[PDB]
Amino acid sequence: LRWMEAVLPLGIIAGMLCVMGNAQYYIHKAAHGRPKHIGNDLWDVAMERRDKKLHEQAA
Amino acid sequence: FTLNFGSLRLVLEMNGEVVERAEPHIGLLHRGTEKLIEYKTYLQALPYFDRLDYVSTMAQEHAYSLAVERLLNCEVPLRAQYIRVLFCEITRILNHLLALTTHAMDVGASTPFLWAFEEREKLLEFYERVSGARMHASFIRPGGVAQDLPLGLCRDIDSFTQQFASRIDELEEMLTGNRIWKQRLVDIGTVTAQQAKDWGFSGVMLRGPGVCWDLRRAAPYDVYDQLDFDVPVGTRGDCYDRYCIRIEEMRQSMRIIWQCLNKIPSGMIKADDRKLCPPSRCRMKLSMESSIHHFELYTEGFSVPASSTYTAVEAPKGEFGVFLVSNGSNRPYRCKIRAPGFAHLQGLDFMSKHHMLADVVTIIGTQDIVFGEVDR
Amino acid sequence: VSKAAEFVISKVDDLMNWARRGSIWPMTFGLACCAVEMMHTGAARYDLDRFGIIFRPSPRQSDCMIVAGTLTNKMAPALRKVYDQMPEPRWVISMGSCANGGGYYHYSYSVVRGCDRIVPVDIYVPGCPPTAEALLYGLLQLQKKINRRKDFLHWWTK
Amino acid sequence: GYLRCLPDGNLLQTKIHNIGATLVGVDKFGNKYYEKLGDTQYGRHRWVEYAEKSRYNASQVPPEWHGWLHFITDHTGDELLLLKPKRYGVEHKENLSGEGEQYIYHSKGHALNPGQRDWTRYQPWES
Amino acid sequence: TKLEDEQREQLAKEISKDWSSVFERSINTLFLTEMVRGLMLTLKYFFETKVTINYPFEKGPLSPRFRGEHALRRYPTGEERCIACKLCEAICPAQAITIEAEEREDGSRRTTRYDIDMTKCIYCGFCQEACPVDAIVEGPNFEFATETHEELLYDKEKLLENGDRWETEIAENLRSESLYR
Amino acid sequence: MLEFAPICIYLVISLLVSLILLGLPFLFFDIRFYLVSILFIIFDLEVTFFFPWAVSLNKIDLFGFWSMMAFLLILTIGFLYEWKRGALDW
Amino acid sequence: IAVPAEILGIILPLLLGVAFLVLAERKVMAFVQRRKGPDVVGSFGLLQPLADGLKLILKEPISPSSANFFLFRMAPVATFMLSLVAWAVVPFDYGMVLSDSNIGLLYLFAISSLGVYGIITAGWSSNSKYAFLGALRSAAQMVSYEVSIGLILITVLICVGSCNLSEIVMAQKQIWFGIPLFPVLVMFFISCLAETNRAPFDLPEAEAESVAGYNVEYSSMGFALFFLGEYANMILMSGLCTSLSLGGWLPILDLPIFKRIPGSIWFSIKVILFLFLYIWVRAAFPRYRYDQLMGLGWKVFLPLSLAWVVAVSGVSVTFPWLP
Amino acid sequence: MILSVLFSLALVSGLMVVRAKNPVHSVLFFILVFCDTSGLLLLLGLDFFAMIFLVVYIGAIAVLFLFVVMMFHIQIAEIHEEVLRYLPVSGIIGLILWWEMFFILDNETIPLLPTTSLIYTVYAGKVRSWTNLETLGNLLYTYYFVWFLVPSLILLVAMIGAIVLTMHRTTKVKRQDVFRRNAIDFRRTIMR
Ligand code: SF4
Ligand code: SF4
Numbered sequence A: 001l002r003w004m005e006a007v008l009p010l011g012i013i014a015g016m017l018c019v020m021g022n023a024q025y026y027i028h029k030a031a032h033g034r035p036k037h038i039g040n041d042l043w044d045v046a047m048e049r050r051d052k053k054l055h056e057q058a059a
Numbered sequence B: 001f002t003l004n005f006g007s008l009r010l011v012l013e014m015n016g017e018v019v020e021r022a023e024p025h026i027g028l029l030h031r032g033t034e035k036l037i038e039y040k041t042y043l044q045a046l047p048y049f050d051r052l053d054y055v056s057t058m059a060q061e062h063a064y065s066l067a068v069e070r071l072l073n074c075e076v077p078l079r080a081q082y083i084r085v086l087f088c089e090i091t092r093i094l095n096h097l098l099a100l101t102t103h104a105m106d107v108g109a110s111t112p113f114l115w116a117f118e119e120r121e122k123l124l125e126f127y128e129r130v131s132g133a134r135m136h137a138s139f140i141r142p143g144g145v146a147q148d149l150p151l152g153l154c155r156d157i158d159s160f161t162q163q164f165a166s167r168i169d170e171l172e173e174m175l176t177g178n179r180i181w182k183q184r185l186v187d188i189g190t191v192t193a194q195q196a197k198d199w200g201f202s203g204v205m206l207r208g209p210g211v212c213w214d215l216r217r218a219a220p221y222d223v224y225d226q227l228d229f230d231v232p233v234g235t236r237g238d239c240y241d242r243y244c245i246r247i248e249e250m251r252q253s254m255r256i257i258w259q260c261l262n263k264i265p266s267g268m269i270k271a272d273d274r275k276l277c278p279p280s281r282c283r284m285k286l287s288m289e290s291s292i293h294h295f296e297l298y299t300e301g302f303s304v305p306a307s308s309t310y311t312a313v314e315a316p317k318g319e320f321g322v323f324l325v326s327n328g329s330n331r332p333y334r335c336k337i338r339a340p341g342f343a344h345l346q347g348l349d350f351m352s353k354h355h356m357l358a359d360v361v362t363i364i365g366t367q368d369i370v371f372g373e374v375d376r
Numbered sequence C: 001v002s003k004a005a006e007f008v009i010s011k012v013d014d015l016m017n018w019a020r021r022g023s024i025w026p027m028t029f030g031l032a033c034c035a036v037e038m039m040h041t042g043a044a045r046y047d048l049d050r051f052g053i054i055f056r057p058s059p060r061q062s063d064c065m066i067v068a069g070t071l072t073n074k075m076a077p078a079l080r081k082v083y084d085q086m087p088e089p090r091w092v093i094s095m096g097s098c099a100n101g102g103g104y105y106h107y108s109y110s111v112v113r114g115c116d117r118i119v120p121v122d123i124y125v126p127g128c129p130p131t132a133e134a135l136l137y138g139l140l141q142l143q144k145k146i147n148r149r150k151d152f153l154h155w156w157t158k
Numbered sequence D: 001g002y003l004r005c006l007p008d009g010n011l012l013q014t015k016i017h018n019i020g021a022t023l024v025g026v027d028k029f030g031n032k033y034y035e036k037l038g039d040t041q042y043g044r045h046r047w048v049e050y051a052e053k054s055r056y057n058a059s060q061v062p063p064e065w066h067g068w069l070h071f072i073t074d075h076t077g078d079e080l081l082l083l084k085p086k087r088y089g090v091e092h093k094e095n096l097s098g099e100g101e102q103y104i105y106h107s108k109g110h111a112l113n114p115g116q117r118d119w120t121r122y123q124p125w126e127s
Numbered sequence E: 001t002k003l004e005d006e007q008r009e010q011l012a013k014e015i016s017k018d019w020s021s022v023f024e025r026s027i028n029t030l031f032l033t034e035m036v037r038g039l040m041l042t043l044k045y046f047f048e049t050k051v052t053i054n055y056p057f058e059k060g061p062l063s064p065r066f067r068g069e070h071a072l073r074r075y076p077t078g079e080e081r082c083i084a085c086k087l088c089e090a091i092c093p094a095q096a097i098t099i100e101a102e103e104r105e106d107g108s109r110r111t112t113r114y115d116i117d118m119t120k121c122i123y124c125g126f127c128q129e130a131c132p133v134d135a136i137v138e139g140p141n142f143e144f145a146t147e148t149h150e151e152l153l154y155d156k157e158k159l160l161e162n163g164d165r166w167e168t169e170i171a172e173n174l175r176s177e178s179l180y181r
Numbered sequence F: 001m002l003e004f005a006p007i008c009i010y011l012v013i014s015l016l017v018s019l020i021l022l023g024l025p026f027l028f029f030d031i032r033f034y035l036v037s038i039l040f041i042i043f044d045l046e047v048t049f050f051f052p053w054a055v056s057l058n059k060i061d062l063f064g065f066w067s068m069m070a071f072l073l074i075l076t077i078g079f080l081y082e083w084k085r086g087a088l089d090w
Numbered sequence G: 001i002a003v004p005a006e007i008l009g010i011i012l013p014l015l016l017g018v019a020f021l022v023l024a025e026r027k028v029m030a031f032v033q034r035r036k037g038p039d040v041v042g043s044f045g046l047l048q049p050l051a052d053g054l055k056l057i058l059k060e061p062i063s064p065s066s067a068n069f070f071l072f073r074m075a076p077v078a079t080f081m082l083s084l085v086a087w088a089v090v091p092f093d094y095g096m097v098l099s100d101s102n103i104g105l106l107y108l109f110a111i112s113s114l115g116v117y118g119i120i121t122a123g124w125s126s127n128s129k130y131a132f133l134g135a136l137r138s139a140a141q142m143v144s145y146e147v148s149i150g151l152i153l154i155t156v157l158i159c160v161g162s163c164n165l166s167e168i169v170m171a172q173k174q175i176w177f178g179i180p181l182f183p184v185l186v187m188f189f190i191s192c193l194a195e196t197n198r199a200p201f202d203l204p205e206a207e208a209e210s211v212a213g214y215n216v217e218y219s220s221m222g223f224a225l226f227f228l229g230e231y232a233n234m235i236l237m238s239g240l241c242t243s244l245s246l247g248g249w250l251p252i253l254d255l256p257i258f259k260r261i262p263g264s265i266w267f268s269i270k271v272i273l274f275l276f277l278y279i280w281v282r283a284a285f286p287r288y289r290y291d292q293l294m295g296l297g298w299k300v301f302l303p304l305s306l307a308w309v310v311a312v313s314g315v316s317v318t319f320p321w322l323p
Numbered sequence H: 001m002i003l004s005v006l007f008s009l010a011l012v013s014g015l016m017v018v019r020a021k022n023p024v025h026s027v028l029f030f031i032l033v034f035c036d037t038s039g040l041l042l043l044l045g046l047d048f049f050a051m052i053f054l055v056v057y058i059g060a061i062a063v064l065f066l067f068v069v070m071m072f073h074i075q076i077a078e079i080h081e082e083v084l085r086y087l088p089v090s091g092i093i094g095l096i097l098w099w100e101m102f103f104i105l106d107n108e109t110i111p112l113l114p115t116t117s118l119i120y121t122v123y124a125g126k127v128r129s130w131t132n133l134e135t136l137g138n139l140l141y142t143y144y145f146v147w148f149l150v151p152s153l154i155l156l157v158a159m160i161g162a163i164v165l166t167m168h169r170t171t172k173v174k175r176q177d178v179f180r181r182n183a184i185d186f187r188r189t190i191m192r
């Protein structure tokens, strides 16, 4: 268990990485209403703008 | 251009990171040891030798006691001789461990330091059990030793010898054979045997070139001529071969320690004559003559015949010599202290020539300059 | 001056003292033959890294100077020069007998009769050499001494 | 004293080590002396809990238990208390050395001494 | 350097006897075998038990013949054990002991002044072994670090109170070591 | 693009936090270096040319692969020149 | 808006991770050396980084007055900026990126290229010439091993058609690239060890040795910022190693028991193993001389990296194994 | 607006390069103007070209200039001249070049005066958007390989010139050799 006590500070680094990643993810999700897309391009941007305009016109 | 480093002060002349020459300034630890020894009695001067070359404590006590006995002609009992040999080899192991690990730290290897300090703590526990303190234990005196071994010390030393064989194998496996260690050591600060003889090298720094000469075999000053140990020599004197020689010397010191433990006799621990060795507490509290002799030996000292001699021993650093000149009085008239760091630090100049700064620090670590003995 | 502001000041001072006590960064001044015992203190057995002690080779980053060994007239100017570069929050631990009052070379030329004549030393560690146990005791004593520093209270009540 | 473990971490190590230990004794100052043999390394088979969690000091160990704790003797502190001398002797006092000028030791010639003694080794005429 | 060159060529020929040996050497130098072995030993010591002493609660082993703090003892009756024989400073190599004395009121020889510098004592035990009456002993205590040099300058009263405080442990050590004498 | 605005804001916030960290206490010759730099320039150009080649291996055929190999061979001869001349040594 | 919140939530936990990383380095090195690290400042020394930071803050600063005050002060700021903006792109899972740049690899390479300027200016602005020489040495070493690192990046870019780390990982889905390119991963690990001046190739931290360093003149916060930048770079390059040769946020064997773990946990675990390897190598090996490490970087890793680039390109072009 | 700020910073950094007293400050402001040009490339849309400007100009050439400038240790009054005397000729030449810029802009490139709603989006080339890096690699390695192989000759010439100009091997300095016998086999020897 001594090895566990020595690795315990490393677990804090892993937790910090998880916290930064997940906090970023959920703030972006709340800001936009959908998880961030990593494969987006000009086509995806145009489609998302068209979707926004169509939905705001329908509503 | 001149680059200055500031108790090791060193000025280096550099051209292209290549060390053209190195000049050390040493006096930073001068303490007037010789003057104080002249001003103090022999027994009061033994702690000065304790303090000189402090990494190897009891070697200096052994040298001083041998010089005093040579000027005094007093027979030391076999048990005292054997325990002196045992603790001299323990001292050699301690000094070699510290030298190797400080050299490894200076190179960059940090981890063997603490393992060898665990071993050194065990050995200092041995010192503290047998004598007063862990370091600077005034245990070896002219005519014998201060006190007898406590019971169980031999068994503890045997256990340490086994675990320490394991530890030396361990350290050699980690350090020897490492590519980085080899690149740091090999072909660094090489010395020819002619150069070593000219510059007065001794010990590992002299056997590294391969002069094939050891003091414990040339002039056996103890039961050494009954211990059939081995003396390693280097094929081509450099840092790597000196390190390997130090490892082999640690192994042979363990061998000698086991032999002394096996064949230690039963008897007395100091010279039989109370004119030169203090009587026991019971004897001085019970006997009139013993009380007189204790009083006289602790106010005055033993008056050595007027003579001058040079007594040298194989200290772990190298040949440690003491030149004692007396005048028939209770105080030493003159005491010159030849330490095997004074010559090696001279050798630094030509050893670290055309090398670099890391090679300079590696050479310093290999020579193992303790500044107390060079500033004696 | 009040009783709640005093409590807040006491808490702030306690936090500051806790930080300075748990993050001591001493620098070795390792002359003569207390430095070997100091390395024994820094070894695995009586480890110093547990309490926050780590040896900083640069005097500009160090907290307290631990002078262990004999101080020579040839080296005292160097000791003073190195001490002067240390930051204002600073302390001195004089280890052994040579650095306290000259020790075994008190009546000797080119030997400073203790480091107290060159730098203001806070804690002396008697011994020759002091056991690594005793040196770690002295470091804990330094922690205790800096555990009663009311710097914020003194600044407030000026 | 278990809440001190979180901001101490050293008392935490002591409490971790007191899992399988046996309380070999206790002194009059409250220090509880523990021994733990078996599968334990040599250097860590005897220890003390000072019972003063806030400001425990290494000098609080009385001379009766000092040797046993430092592995000098196999005699516990109770036997040394039984063997304590009579007709003289003082109680154990910690190494204050900074807790106050009225607590620390002062020389006979020091200005801080309650009674300062002159040192001249001659008596003037004193008209 | 021609000798060095030909020695290098001879060594290279010696350690390149066959393709098996050259391939083994090249693979060993390329795949970091020694580095891996050192890493494995390092991991073994990472997973092995530690030898840290845990200072304030667990203290390192000592011996009865330990040279700690100078101190002065007393007889079981209560009188000072120290006659003024002045063998302390006659043998003290560092001259850290200063003693003055005169005849007491009842004709007994006692020291009227006895001070020891703990900043000048080298902790060598010469006085404790030169004492004819076992009066001065270097006690087992060593954690007596002081904040002031004047505190470290002892005297007779402080030495006597140290002896009274540590009388039992000093007596045990003195018995054990008088066996070894 | 549209993705480097977070990078710019990150740079600004990093400046702010670095300045705050600095201000917290305030509340209370040799030719070897030149040769190394020249080699750095050459191999930065090498890697800069590798990047598009590595990305577009699927479109460029054996023609493109062998053109890159010829480029390397032209520049690897320069590396052999460096090795034999002694520029890589110190 | 939400972008500053995301940036703060990336930056502050990174500083906490750096503090606990130096604490973990102490603990792991001590446990290697048969001792125990910081255990007296808080339970198991968890408050030791807090105590150290508070002491550094409370330490009174000193002004060298080097006639280059602005450049002296701003160099650690520059390296801290570089470390943070390098961390601004590294992914943690599917969609946890601030800037999903299509050129993420070259962005990280450029940021690593800019990293030498902080040390160079720190060495020059200092009065002492020893610090300037040490800064020059460190800059040159980082230069050589960054050339090697760029070649390794080119190998990975040959393996994966895209240039963004997220799609790199999505390609890593199959074989993790470490199974095919374990020697390349080893060379990249040694190159990043020499890039951050950590483990062997440790010139600036050899202060007890004659090389000294570029941080000798720096005050409390300058030294603290340089240390934070170095350790943030260490974590950054561990993340680069796991994103390039260990698949990032990808489980092992794609078993459904392993998919219960979010994946950010997987990335964190791999980064932790790489940091443990960093401390392991630092504690277990000696250090190289400057000339030795420079010759090794320019003569051992550069030819091997070029050869591996050529070999991977030849394997992929010959067979239909091309994206 | 961001474009205006960026090239205002670039112009100020260039002016500081021109009129900087210290060559080290000149190198640093050169780095700054390169960074501003990289930002302009981001605004244009050439991410690859901005990154390679950073890598090469900011990294390689600028560390080269910094190394050489710091290693020279140039002192003031060694490179020092009053700038007031050359102000008239600098102004005249700059005004002539600016007037020529005026004439060039007045004829070919006419600025547009105020748009977004009239943008006709093809949607045909966006199904597979080729990046700048991808297009540059495809072209440079397929159909313009000669203009890619020629710079290899230029780099080879640069390396050869750098060596033949700034090489100085030590005439008499010992060099460590690791291939020694004690390093290779190390047969143990003793005194006996
Ligand atoms: S006090 Fe004693 S142990 Fe320390 S340096 Fe002086 S002589 Fe050596
Ligand atoms: S132990 Fe030695 S130095 Fe100390 S007072 Fe006694 S004789 Fe003097």
Ligand code: SF4
Residues within 6 Å of the ligand: E081, E082, E083, E084, E085, E086, E087, E088, E099, E127, E130, E131, E132, E133, E134, E135, E136
């Ligand atoms: S040797 Fe003993 S009796 Fe004599 S002066 Fe010293 S303590 Fe007193």
